[PDB]
């Protein structure tokens, strides 16, 4: 109304996990 | 590899009794399109049957099932792995080629598949069958702790992950898993720098995984009101140097630019953030990070009609339905009739899963008042709605009392409830006033229908 909706904007940055590909003998 | 491809295109057309030509074809195509290696294994599987009645060696069936593991043919790769197990067990005289290691790799992919086939019991038992015969193996000991990490990050996962590191401290996979344990609880914000700088010695250098994990734990320290204290500006410049270094040594890494856009947005350049993120977006858009970072700009520029879809698209993943952090980003500057009443529905979908948060209970109130001041000030609107509006306003005022008693807050004290509570204490008098309007309008429609009914009686 008076002011906008409260929100904690934070431009996050993640990291992926270990792929663990099947071993191609 | 270019010479091997151009040589393989010469043996593929001609047929000088090709027997192993299709094996060397698929042995290059595993990094390139995954259908090409599959087409070569299909024909290489049948070309080994015309010379004699000879069963297919397990090494080809194991790899053809390995390709289908990454695909949606999980059941068919499972039959390939079962048949690779049955065939490698038959190799009682292949002690030079070590049939035993072939069954080990086939069972490893098979438990990797069972973990992915909604069956962690069979994956645990298959992975323990490798532990019981060879405890000097690392992936079977690392994949067991991941299965228990679903139930909680404090079970045998946090213990198995450190036990693997003592047997092999030069394993970048096992050591990078360590820093991933401290990411559940971010209380180790500043203190994680030490444990992330363990394998930063030159013998491991360069490692992009760790250098970017440093920039991530350094970016998490932003979003603080102490920027005028010349404290967060140095943090921006430090992380920017980390990213510039991993940029000069790797121009094609996406994550370097990922954080660069985050800092440039923290500097106040939303107009020039789109450009940086474009390069990232173009490459692979199918990363959880981008659907969010990109979405903030659109909502920033009063473009909800491109922001609302990107949030939805993130949620298309088979991981959840109603996340809190998304819907927080959803309501920013919403004022519209489709952006207010509907915004209530998504907020309630979020609170259904965990109501213990203070901000959902707060926002639900804010929106409620928004809607009410939009019917109880200038309106002069529908009759039924006036009845409903005071109901909503009562609920809102009940919540204003309930919120105030709560100890912990959103890292910001909620003492400011006074102007919102004042803004329902007056709106109760607006509900008591505008219900008279209701009646006036009531009599108006009654006299309109009667003065119309008499015209119909004339006909």
């Amino acid at each position: 109304e008076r002011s906008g909706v409260v929100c904690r904007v934070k431009y996050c940055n993640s990291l992926p996990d270990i792929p663990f590909d099947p071993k191609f003998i | 590899r270019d010479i091997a491809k151009g040589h393989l295109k010469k043996v593929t057309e001609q047929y000088p009794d090709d027997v192993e030509a299709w094996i060397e074809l698929a042995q290059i195509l595993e990094q390139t399109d995954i259908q090409g290696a599959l087409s070569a294994y299909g024909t290489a599987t049948r070309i080994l049957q015309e010379k004699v009645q000879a069963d297919v060696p397990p090494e080809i069936l194991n790899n053809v099932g390995a390709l289908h593991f990454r695909l949606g043919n999980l059941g068919e790769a499972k039959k390939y792995f079962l048949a690779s197990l049955d065939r490698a067990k038959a190799e009682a005289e292949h002690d030079e080629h070590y049939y035993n290691a072939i069954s080990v790799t086939t069972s490893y992919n098979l438990a990797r598949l069972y973990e992915a086939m909604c069956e962690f019991h069979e994956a645990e038992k298959l992975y323990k069958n490798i532990l019981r015969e060879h405890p000097n193996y690392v992936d079977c000991y690392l994949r067991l702790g991941a299965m228990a990490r679903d139930k909680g990050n404090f079970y045998e996962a946090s213990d198995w992950f450190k036990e693997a590191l003592q047997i092999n401290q030069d394993h970048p996979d096992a050591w990078s898993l360590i820093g991933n344990l401290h990411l559940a609880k971010q209380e180790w914000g500043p203190g994680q720098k030490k444990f992330e700088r363990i394998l930063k010695q030159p013998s491991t250098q360069s490692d992009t995984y760790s250098m970017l994990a440093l920039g991530n734990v350094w970016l998490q320290t932003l979003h603080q009101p102490t920027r005028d204290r010349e404290k967060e500006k140095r943090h921006q410049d430090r992380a920017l140097a980390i990213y510039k270094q991993v940029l000069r040594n790797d121009a094609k890494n996406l994550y370097a630019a990922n954080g660069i856009g985050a800092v440039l947005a923290h500097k106040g350049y939303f107009r020039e953030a789109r450009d940086v993120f474009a390069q990232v977006r173009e490459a692979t858009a199918d990363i959880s990070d981008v659907w969010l970072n990109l979405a903030h700009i659109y909502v920033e520029q009063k473009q909800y009609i491109s922001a609302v879809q990107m949030y939805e698209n993130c949620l298309r993943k088979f991981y959840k339905h109603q996340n809190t952090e998304v819907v927080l980003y959803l309501a920013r500057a919403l004022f519209k009739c489709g952006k207010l009443q509907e915004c209530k529905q998504t907020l309630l979908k979020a609170r259904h899963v965990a109501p213990s948060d203070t901000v959902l209970m707060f926002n639900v109130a804010l929106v409620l008042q928004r809607l009410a001041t939009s019917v109880l000030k200038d309106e002069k609107s529908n009759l039924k709605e006036v009845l409903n509006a005071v109901k909503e306003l009562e609920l809102a005022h009940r919540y204003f009392s309930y919120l105030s008693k709560v100890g912990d807050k959103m890292r910001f004290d909620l003492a400011l409830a006074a102007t919102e509570a004042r803004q329902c204490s007056d709106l109760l008098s607006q509900a008591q006033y505008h219900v008279a309007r209701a009646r006036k309008q009531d009599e108006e429609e009654r006299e309109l229908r009667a003065k119309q009914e008499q015209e119909k009686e004339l006909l």
Binding site: - | R281, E282, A283, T284, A285, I305, S306, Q309, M310, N313
Partner: protein, 149 residues
């Protein structure tokens, strides 16, 4: 500005009705972010595409970044920086139909913008709000470019 629409798309089919003309083919596509459907004729002779190709399609009102709204005549001799300099395939045309899911009472949720690039038809189709930039008999540019990902 003057960016009437943008998304990434992929080629779902090159000409699934079966190649009806030699230098031109009916690309069928869906968009990555706005989940728009698209049908688009391209000069498959000077600009070839296969299935599963990705391209950034930017439907524009003008070519010039400042949005100065050029006239509609050909002038090759021009210094002014264009949008075409960062694209591979650029076309000019008219939106000749706009069509939608309007009811008698309530508004539309989905639009099909139809445009003719001098004969080479295109139907871009999906969320009405993402298509609010289009108005029938306005002039328009295509500005597509293949993503090497």
């Amino acid at each position: 500005a003057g960016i009437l629409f943008e998304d990434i798309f992929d080629v779902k089919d090159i000409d699934p009705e079966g190649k009806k003309f030699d230098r031109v083919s009916r690309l069928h596509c869906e968009s990555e972010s706005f989940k728009m459907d698209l049908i688009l004729d391209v000069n498959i002779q000077i600009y070839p595409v296969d299935l599963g190709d990705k391209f950034r399609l930017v439907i524009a009102s003008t070519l010039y970044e400042d949005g100065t709204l050029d006239d509609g005549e050909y002038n090759p001799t021009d210094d002014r920086p264009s949008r075409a300099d960062q694209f591979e395939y650029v076309m000019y045309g008219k939106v000749y139909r706009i069509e939608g899911d309007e009811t008698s009472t309530e508004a539309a949720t989905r639009l099909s913008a139809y445009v003719s690039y001098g004969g080479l038809l295109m139907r871009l189709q999906g969320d009405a709000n993402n298509l609010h930039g289009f108005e029938v008999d306005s002039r328009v540019y295509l500005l597509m470019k293949k993503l090497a990902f």
